[PDB]
Every structure is written in C-alpha cells, then in structure tokens.
Amino acid sequence: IVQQILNIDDTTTTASKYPKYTVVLGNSISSITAGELTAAVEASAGS
Amino acid sequence: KIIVQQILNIDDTTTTASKYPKYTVVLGNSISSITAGELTAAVE
Amino acid sequence: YYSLMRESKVIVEYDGRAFHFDALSNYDVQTSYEEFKTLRRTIHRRTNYADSVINAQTPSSISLAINFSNTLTEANFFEWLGFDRKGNTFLLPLYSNNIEPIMFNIYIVNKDNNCVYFENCYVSTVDFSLDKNIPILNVGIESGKFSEVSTYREAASIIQGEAMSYSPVIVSTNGNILPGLISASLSFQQQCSWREDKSVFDINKIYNNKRAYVNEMNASATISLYYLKRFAGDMVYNIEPETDVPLNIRNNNISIDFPLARISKRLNFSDVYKVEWDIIPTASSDPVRIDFFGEI
Amino acid sequence: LYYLKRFAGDMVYNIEPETDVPLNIRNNNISIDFPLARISKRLNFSDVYKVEWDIIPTASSDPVRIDFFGEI
Amino acid sequence: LGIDDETYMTIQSSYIKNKLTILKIKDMDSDKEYDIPITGGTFTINNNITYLTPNIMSRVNIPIGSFTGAFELTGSLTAYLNDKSLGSMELYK
Amino acid sequence: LQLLRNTRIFVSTVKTGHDTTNTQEILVQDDISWGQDSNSTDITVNEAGPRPTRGSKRFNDSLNAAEWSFSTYILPYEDTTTGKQIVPDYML
Amino acid sequence: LQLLRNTRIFVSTVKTGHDTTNTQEILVQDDISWGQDSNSTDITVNEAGPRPTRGSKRFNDSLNAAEWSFSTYILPYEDTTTGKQIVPDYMLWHALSSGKAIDLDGDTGAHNNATNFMVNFKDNAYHELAMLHIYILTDNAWSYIDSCQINQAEVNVDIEDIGRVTWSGNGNQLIPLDEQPFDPDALGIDDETYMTIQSSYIKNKLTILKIKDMDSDKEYDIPITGGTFTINNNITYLTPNIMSRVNIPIGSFTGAFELTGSLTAYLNDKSLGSMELYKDLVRTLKVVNRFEIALILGGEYDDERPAAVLVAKQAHVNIPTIETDDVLGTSVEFKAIPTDLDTGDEGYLGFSNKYTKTTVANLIATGDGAETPPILVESITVKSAADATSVTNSDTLQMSVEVTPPEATNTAVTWSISSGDAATIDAESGLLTADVSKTGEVIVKAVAKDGSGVEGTKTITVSAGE
Amino acid sequence: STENRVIDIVVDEKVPYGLIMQFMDVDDSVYPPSEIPVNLTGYSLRGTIKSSLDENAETLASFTTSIIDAAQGAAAISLSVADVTNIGEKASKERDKYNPRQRFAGYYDILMTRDVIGSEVSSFRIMEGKVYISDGVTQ
Amino acid sequence: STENRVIDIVVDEKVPYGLIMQFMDVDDSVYPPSEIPVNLTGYSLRGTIKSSLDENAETLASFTTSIIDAAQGAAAISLSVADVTNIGEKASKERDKYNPRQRFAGYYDILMTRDVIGSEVSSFRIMEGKVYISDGVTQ
C-alpha cells in the first residue's frame, strides 16, 4: 500500500556498506492515475 | 412541533429530510484498487 | 502557527443546535491512549525488548469553570444533567425513567482550523458555592471519544450574555432568617459507568467506549455558620440533628428549596466557634426546586 | 513539544501513535539512537498546547546506540 | 447648584485651630483621671471596602460590586514625659 | 488645556434630576488625586533548541477599580434656613 | 594609579589578529561600569547543651557572570571610503540582532547604503548571538572581558537632551592582561572623524510622533513631553554547581525578545488630539488593537538633516492613564508585536545624517528610504483606432491606452475581453480580433501592469460590412 | 458533525498534478457498508485559484476536469506543469525555517452542476481551502 | 508509518559517490505485513543538484542513474569525482558545529518516472533533501 525504499552507500560495484536509511513513500508506485483512460481506450481498440 | 431540516442538494432531486448524512465523497490522488500489472495485462 | 487558550473557544452541540458559552472562565483537559505490553522473559532468550500494542482511547475527563450569565443559557446544563424543566424551573424527579444519560457533543475551536471534536459525552457533576465571591460554577464532564478536525459548526445567536451583578446570600426556614452565615456550597451529580464493550471482533482495531448507564443521582449541600445561641437554656439552635426541616437558600437571582431535609451538625472550636451543617433530602421529601431570575 | 501542524489537513503530525519510527537524539557531545521505536502521544490544552511523546523500542528493533564525544 | 459668597464669608469665621486641643482620659477600672498634654497624633476611620471583579476570557472584565470589611476606629497620641502627679509618668508606671 | 486649579467637585446621590438637596459642591485643598488603571497580561513561548522561536504577545485583561482622594478643612456652620449646625460635606 | 577618565574602550570580534575591521574603538560618556562578583557559602554547627561548640567556616563557591554597561551619543556619519552612512558602533547593532558574521551589504541585521543605515531583526532566531571580546584600557594597564553578549539597549528619549543609547551586557570572565594586546593608536579613531561626527548630533526636542489606528485609518495628532523605549533579549547565563571547585559560567541562553516604550503627553481638546484618542479607547474596551507607530528623532524637514527613526508596524497599546500634574498629563504604554509569533517582523530602525521629509515616508512605507513606495495606477483611458467604435468582418480594431499616474510602477497595460464573445483582444498588443462568424457587441478591458488590478474598458460593435 | 468541506492541497512544482473524487450513496445496513456509486452522467465540475479573497484578485489557473466513469461515480481534476509553473513564480517568497520548500499560493474552490437544469437549484460548492506550492529543483 | 520523503546526503571530497536503493511494496492487510520486491521494469530515474531553491540557481551536478536488478527492485545513482570537485569548490566555508568536517553545498531531488502502460508516462518526486560535502585530509 505504502511502499518502502531502502537506500545504502555503494562502495564497489554490487558491494555496499551497512549504514542504511529508509524512505516510506505514502502511495504505491503501482497505484494508477488518469492512465486509466488511455488504457481503457487501447483495450477497447483491441476489442 | 418538531421541525427537521437539511440542505437541498442538486443530485438528490427531492425527498424527505433525514437525521443523517446520505452521500459521501471520497478523495484520493491515485487509485490503489488497480495495479499496473493488471492494467498492463488487460491492454496486452 | 501556534495555539493559545487566551483565544480558544468552546461550542456545545446538541439536538441539532449549538451553544456558544462565550463567558468561559477556565477549562482543563487531557487525552491519552491505552497500551498492552509484555516482556516475555524466556530461558531460551532473556529478551530485553518489550512487545506492545496500542488499543484504545482513554475516556477523557473535562473540567469547566463558568460565570453566571444573564440570558441564563447555562440552565441547559441542568437540563442535560437530567432535571426536568418547566420554563426556568427545574425539578428532580423522585424516580427516573432514564437508563442512559443524555449524550451530547463538543467542539473546541481555535484559529487556523486547529480544531478538536469530542463526540460522545455526558455530564457527571455540577458544583458551586455562594462563598462571598462571584459565584463560579464548576462542571465535570466525561467524554468517550475524541479526534482532531479542521472545522466546526457555527453558532452565533445562542451566545452566553453578560455576567449578572453581585448580591449576598440568604438562608431561611419558613421565613426565619438564619443568623451569622459564613458560606453555602452545593453539589449535584449524575454518577454513571461506561459499559465495557471490547471484543475479539475489535482485534487490530482501535476501540472506544460507546454507551454508559446511570448509576445514581445526588443533590447535597454544606453550610458554614458562626455558633450562636439566643439564651443559654435554648433548644432551637442546639447541636442535636434536626430532621424534617424545610430549607430555602437564595441570592437575588438564584433560588434553591428543599421541602424537607435532614441536617447533620459538626462543631469546630476554632478561634471563633464554627458550625457546619450537612444537608440532605428526606426520602418522603417533595421535589427540590431551583429557579433563576434575570437582572433588569 | 509544542503542538504544531504544517497545514490543517496534514497527517504526519497528527495525534495518532506512529510505530517503527527511527529516532535520534543528540547534543554536541552526546548521541542516542533508537533504530525503531513506538510512540505514544498525550496532548495537554495548557495555555500553549503541549504534546508529550512516550518512547519505547520495538521488539524487532536493533541495538540502541549511545556515543560520547569530547570537546576540544 | 454651587455654593455662594454669603456661605463663603460665614464659614471662614469658623476654622478650628489644632493647637488649642484638649485631651481628656479616664481609667474606668479605677475612676482615676490622668492629666495629659499632647504633642501631635492622628486618628482614622476605615471600612476596609473590597471590590470584586470577574475573570472572563474574551472580554475586558470590569468590577461588578463591593463588600464591606471590619469597621475600624483607631488613633495615636504623642506626649512629653512629665513627672507631675497623674501625669504621663504615672500612667506609664 | 485642562488646568488642575480650575477643578470643581460636585457630588450627588443621583445621576439625574440634580437639585440643591441631592447634590452638593465641595471645597478642596489642591492635593486631589483620581484615576483608573489597566491590567495587561503578557505571554511568550519558552523554547529550547538551536534556532528557537522568539516572539511574544500580550492582551489587555481587566481594569482595576477607580480610586479617588481629596482633603478638606473642617468647617461647621449654622444652616441659614433652619438654625441648625451643619458642615458642607454632611452627605459624606 | 588608574584614573577612570583615562579609560578607553576597544571591542573586537577576535582575540588575535586585530585590525581596523574586526576591532573598533568606541566613545563613552563617563558613566561606565563593569565588574565581576563572588558567591561565598558560610556554615556553622547549630548545637544545644550547656557548653556548646561555637565556631564557623566558610568557602568561596562560585562567581557570578561578569557585567558591564556604558552609554553613548547617537552619531550617524558618512563612511569616507564608501559614501555610505554608518554609526561608529555598528558592530553592536549587529551583535544585538544576528547570530552570524557582520554582513552590512545584505538586507537583515545591520545593513546600509548611501541613503541610510538600517536595522531589522529578521534573523534573530539563534540561541546565542554573535559574541564579542572587550579590551578595556586604562593608562598603561590593560584588561579584558572574554565572550560577552549584549543583553539590553535602552533609548532614553527625553525632551531636554541629546539622543543617547545606554547599553548593557554580560560575559564569562574578566581577565587582567599583562601587556598591550594591540596598538590602541593605530587601531583608534582619528580627528577627521572626531570633527566630521560632531556636525551630526541629534536634538531630542525636535522629535515628532506619528500614529495611526489600523482599525479605522484614523490619524491622531499627538505632541509628546518625554518617553522611553527599550530593546532587550533577556539573556541568561548558566553555571555549574560542582563541589571542590570554584564553578564558573559555561554558556548562555536567549529569552523572549522585547521591544517596548512609553510616551507622556498633555491632554489636548483639539480634534484628533489625545482627548479624542483617550475617549475612543476607553469608550470601546478592545481586548486587542492595532496601531502603526513611527518615532522620528530630530524630526523631518525639506532640509537634509540628521535623524533617527523607529518603526513598529503592529504595536499593541495599553489603555492610557490620566495623571494629575498641575496640567493634566496622560501616559501611553506600547509594545511592538509581530504579525505572527514566528516572524521577525517586530519593527525596524533607520539612521541618517541627511534624511528628508520624503525619505522618512519611504522608510515607513517600505523599510528603506532609497526607493519610493510602489505607486499604483488610478486611471486607464482606453482608446481605439481613429476613435472607431466598431470593427467589421475581415477587420481588426487596434486599441491603445493612456494611464495615470505616470509614476505608477508600470503604466503599460495587458488587454482582455470583459464581456461578449464576438471578439477576442490580443492581450499584449490590444488588437481586438473580431470573429467573422458572429456579429454582436463586446466590452474590451485593459489592466495596468503595475499589478493594481485597476482597469479601463471600452465598448466595441462587431459588425457586418456596410 | 459538519461536512468537513475545508481541505488544503500541496502541489509539487514542475510536475503534473491530479486528483480523483468518487461520489457514493452509503447504507449502513450491515457491517460491510452498502456503498453505491452515484451516476455522474450530465454533471460538470468547475474550479479556480485566486491570489486573495477579493472582487478583483489575480487569477492563477483554471482546473482541467473530466469524468472518468459515470457509473463508478468518479470525476477527476488536474493541473499541468505549465499551470503549476505559473503558480510557482507568483506565490509568496516566505519560507519556514524547518520547512523551507513550502510556500503559500492561494485560495481554491470547487463547484459542481447538472448539465441540464433542475431549476429549483442548479449547483453546489463541493469543497474549498488553500493551496501551497513545494519548490523543486529538477526538470 | 511516517510518510518520510526526505533524506539528506553526505558526499566526500576527492572520492566518487554512489548510492543503491531497493524497492519493496508492503501490504499490512495481514500480519505481520508482507514485504515484496517491486518489479522495476520500465521505470526511470533523474535528479539534479543546485545551490538554492531559487528559480535562477545554477546547477552544480546531475546524477548518473541506472537500473541494477529489475526483478529485485534494485537501482543505483552516482556522481563522478569531477562532479565532487565542483561541489567542493562551490560549497560553503561555514562548517557545522555538530561535525566540523561537513559543509553545506545545495539541494537535490531524484524525480522518478514510469512509462509502462499504454505508452504514456507519469512522474513523481520520490526523494528529496539537502546535500553536504565532508572534507578529507587524504588527497
């Protein structure tokens, strides 16, 4: 629902150091917007 | 003896006044009920 | 934007109308949440970090101090407390058909939409004295639920007017005035209990109290006097407890009457000898009366 | 704390008890850290509205840290 | 509604000079009658009135009545010590 | 401009229908004093931290009771219409 | 022996590397005071019995914070190298009102230009203000107060005398120095300054007061007979209470800011005079009020003159009192108030040797004397090509304006249509473009680019061909 | 209670903005509430932002609006990056010490109507409050 | 929990910088709340640093940005050493009393977009804050 981003220092590519922080974004990146309209349009054109 | 009253909305047409709210409007900035995975599968 | 009591406002909402007690003198309030907590010591692991959850809003107490106001709006406190009403007259019914106390609703309002709302409330006490000072009425209230909110119902005609002028107390019995008064103090009560409703259906939800039942009502008073006797052998002003005394107490603007009362006495050998009367109605007594009169 | 709100409809500084808050407290010379904490709130309508937070670590929280630093 | 000059001239015949003061005093426990010149004093009457005021918020409170304290009537006398019989010395003793 | 020496004092038992009986002028020595005074309440936020808030507000709350004083020579005289003694300030 | 009259005062932002910029000599009146004081604890055994013990002991426990005060004539002058106005003690005004490095080219705390020196408190939010070191010199004998802070600055506006400031403040520790820390006569003031400045004294008797009730736009007219105002920070010093040591203060904290004053006047029956002010307040009993106030030391003129102005945009005023001087007097107490408890908009000050009756009005309107207020358009005359009242199909009517007052911050206009639909005006050019598909009537509008939101209009007929 | 009509909004600058609102009847007949979407066919929404509550205040923007679903009872309103960029230059210059990005912009007001009149009444004020802008440093 | 969008950053002089982040959707309908890796397909990131919020304030740097493990919700952002030198040159001299090695340098924002559905795009300001340089005596 909310989505959680963990972020952390990068030391050497693909390796990382423990000091860590958290972002708590209040709305999922999956939640849609007015894109609903154009998606309905293109689904109807597929129909 | 008793009188009860409510505001006259534009949608309700006309009906007897009532001792409760009727309608509710819900607000959001986004829809959580639809996932991108669903909407993409539906288009695809 | 901060907030300030010196410009706070209180509005009472009931019956689909709203009462602006403009003439507030003081108020005090708290709010809190109850929590369940366990430390789960275990010989596998003597855990040091507690496990705990918040469950419910505590029932807030509310306390108010109000000056008497011409236009008498505060009589509605007695009406809500459960006196029956006959114009400006109030009566205790000798027996009562209520079970639940009269529920009502409260806004606390401030600048910048910074408002608070208390949803279910009942009056538990009204209490005042005529002790040689501007009579200030205390009220004790409880409320079962609160929340913060951005707005409030306007109220503008039902505003508590100007304060009534001072006047001295009188006490009397059958029109005998009583010599050497020092004070009179009154209290009226509506003792109640909340019905605990919490259920396993409420798990992982915040819970509130929602209903209460009336346990009792009380009306009682105290009087303080200087000790006096008419002649040494007299009997009328002795210590011994009288009973079935009709008793009347008033100011210029307020009147209280006990048609029959029982009097306890206590005597104190302070530097001037003092007497306290404790007053209560008798079981056969008729309805105690209260009246209000507006100053011109 | 003094009671404050950013805008009237805001949610971040409400009364309701947050949980899993990472919290850090320091002076110049002393530092304390709770990696995750549970917050009770109480509000008092004193002349300026005041709020008290009651803090406790959560069962899953990592070790609370304390540091000291000497002044030069 | 003011005063008038016939009053203003009658009255100024009637001033009282303090220096001509006499004091009379007597002990009712003995009928004894001391004889005491004075050198200055005072007396004062006061009611100890008090004013009562509200303390409403959202308004400027103004006093709404008053009450009366204990009545008082007191004074002070100052004298030279005089060895004359029934004088201040004998009173003092 | 109001000069104090021009001051005159009238007392009355009434607000209206003043007459030579309900109302009386009195003499004074020039040591008269009178007035009324204001009580004002000041509030400021006590704050900690590195970058505190700083301001204050204040409110006029209430007035003290008005106060007056004056002094007068003692002046007994005979009331010209009655032959009784009086002093001009008997009403006091 | 140290004679007080030989005293010289140097202040600095630094302990070392003193120069003509970080360090400043200041003048004084001979009322200076300074020092530090000891707290000492006495203990004795309280004993009973026939032959008691009898003695006592005492211990030095701790020192109070050091304290200092001095007073100075107000003396605005032109900085010979820049042409800006300053006063010799500007560093104090900064330390009164900042937590950061002196930045007199900026716009808050002390800042200046060729027209004025100005102070505003907008940056007062720090818990410790910028601190100072004071080198008090006595003849052949130095001394030093480490890390002091300016607690208070009174201005004793008093009709008979020259305008003076009285300062005070407190510091951690008085240090007796052994030897000259820096050259007092390289780093001192000079006689060209000493002779320039003495042209610029301010006479209090020429004071003017301006006052206005923002609830009514009413403008009372009030002579004064003396007053004061005072600024203070309510600094507090914190000290330990260790045993076995003499405790010394280790830091300070800042109280609520304060800016208040008092005015005393004769009761005057003249309309809009103090009598009418007195009535209007006492008759009405407001809980809160809003007065604009400006205090103009030295006055204002069409000359260029020395002056010093206090401005308070939002002052609250207490209910005035009568007092029975042989001529009836009245007392007015006022306090500055910010529009919000957060903001620093308490008020501001301005100093000059050369203000005028215009520059003061600029300052009171804007907080600077240099620019004018932004004047706004009063009238927009709307005109059309050859005074044509109509436009045809396949035609467009050019429109133009003439705008007053010409000093309005911009007299150009932006066009729009205020009513009707048969035409749309090109908002920038004023070319009314008729729509060929309809005939009708429209009302064109122009609005000034000064931002006044004041308008002009003209009615145009959109028409078919003849 | 009262309608809670008063709501304030924050717009993130240099980025498009959109809000969705759904109108429902509700019957409290059973614990899972009997909520029902209202038919929005033939309704329209209007709204504007002005710098101050005055007869001739400046107007900053008009909302873009539409109905997404007449039967799910959903309308939406939105602002483009061009609109909110026009806001960001005319909103005020004050910044809070603890919250430097947030700036006051103006007052707003949402009004709804039937497209074909009921005549006895024709429109009502859904909601109102004020608008803040949050400054941002990317494009 | 708290909707914190805000984090400050500490780069270090003479040394390249890089940050990795992991996206998880968390659902609290059932207990304990379930954490799931976000499929990061089709998203993209941007962000910039400039010395003040002002609309004229000059850009100091922009991030290199890349997706790392789309099935695992991993992405990374970084700054080259030259960028770090520019930061260190432009930054304040003023120091910080809690850590005298840190100097203030500017504001940043890592605006993120999705272009997944219907070939149409949307963008939101996922993370924001200040950025500091820490000084280093090793060269």
Automatic annotation (TrEMBL), chain A:
Subcellular location: Virion
Protein name: L-shaped tail fiber assembly
Native source organism of the sequence: Escherichia phage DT57C
Gene that specifies this protein: ltfA
Residue window of the full protein shown: 8 to 54 of 1076
From TrEMBL, chain C:
Protein's UniProt name: Minor tail protein
Organism of this sequence: Escherichia phage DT57C
Source species taxonomy: Viruses, Duplodnaviria, Heunggongvirae, Uroviricota, Caudoviricetes
Automatic annotation (TrEMBL), chain F:
Entry superkingdom: Viruses
Identification of the protein by name: Tail tube protein
Gene encoding the protein: mtp
Range of the intact protein held here: 3 to 94 of 468
Automatic annotation (TrEMBL), chains H, I:
Alphabetized InterPro entries for the sequence: LtfC/p132/Gp6_b-sand
Organism annotation: Escherichia phage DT57C
Pfam families xrefs: LtfC (PF23926)
LtfC/p132/Gp6 beta-sandwich domain residues: 3-134
Protein name: L-shaped tail fiber assembly
Superkingdom classification of source: Viruses
